[PDB]
């Protein structure tokens, strides 16, 4: 599924992301925008370590979720990666929340650092009523 902007904003809000560990809804939106274009089915294979990034947040299969085919895999979110490919993003949100409890917080995502940090992110929530 590809979310509409305000549809996704309301959904993330409903799942408790707005202000989670001090991270604004606006920044979570920018993350989803620049990881996957709001697309739950997004996948990116990394031939370098045979890992795959999954779902709207492009969560990687080496550390976070189990896809059964990534060598040296840890499953820190304790989730099947397939769970991160579903229309309902509840599981993806919980895993994203786990990611940011690590010291880097939302900086864990290099696309966020390059596309969001230090840039306008108000545009992602403007007009949504969230």
């Amino acid at each position, epitope marked *: 599924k590809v979310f509409e902007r305000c549809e996704l904003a309301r959904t993330l*809000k409903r799942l408790g992301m*707005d*202000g*989670y*560990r*001090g991270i*604004s809804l*606006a920044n979570w939106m920018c993350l989803a925008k620049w990881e996957s274009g709001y697309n739950t089915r997004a996948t990116n294979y990394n031939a370098g370590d045979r890992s795959t990034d999954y779902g709207i947040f492009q969560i990687n299969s080496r550390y976070w979720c189990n896809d059964g085919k990534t060598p040296g895999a840890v499953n820190a979110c304790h989730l099947s990666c397939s769970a991160l490919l579903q229309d309902n993003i509840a599981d993806a949100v919980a895993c994203a929340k786990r990611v940011v409890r690590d010291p880097q917080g*939302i900086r864990a995502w290099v696309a966020w650092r390059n596309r969001c940090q230090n840039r306008d992110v108000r545009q992602y929530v403007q007009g949504c009523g969230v």
Partner: nanobody
Amino acid sequence: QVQLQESGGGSVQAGGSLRLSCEASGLSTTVMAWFRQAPGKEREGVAAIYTGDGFPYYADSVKGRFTISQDNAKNRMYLQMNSLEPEDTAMYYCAAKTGAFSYGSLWWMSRAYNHWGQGTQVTVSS
């Protein structure tokens, strides 16, 4: 919990400025804000800032004139109030959250906040 301590405030003439600061102790904050209670008006969110990413919200009436910022090193948040006008006269209150916003809860809603400062008087005259 979270103890909030406000500093700054006072009297100033229109066009002038004041800097308010609020320092949090206790649980770590997710959001810190200034509210204000103007005379003969209902209380109101003025500006808010997310502790983790520094994202700010501003009330329409202070956009471009007020700047909210922070130094997490000192668990300290600042409100730089520029181009002050008589109608900015009010009691300003620091507020803080330790968790996320519930659905239906907006940054400017006092109910969204669980911790409050004691209030700081700001008087702007023509």
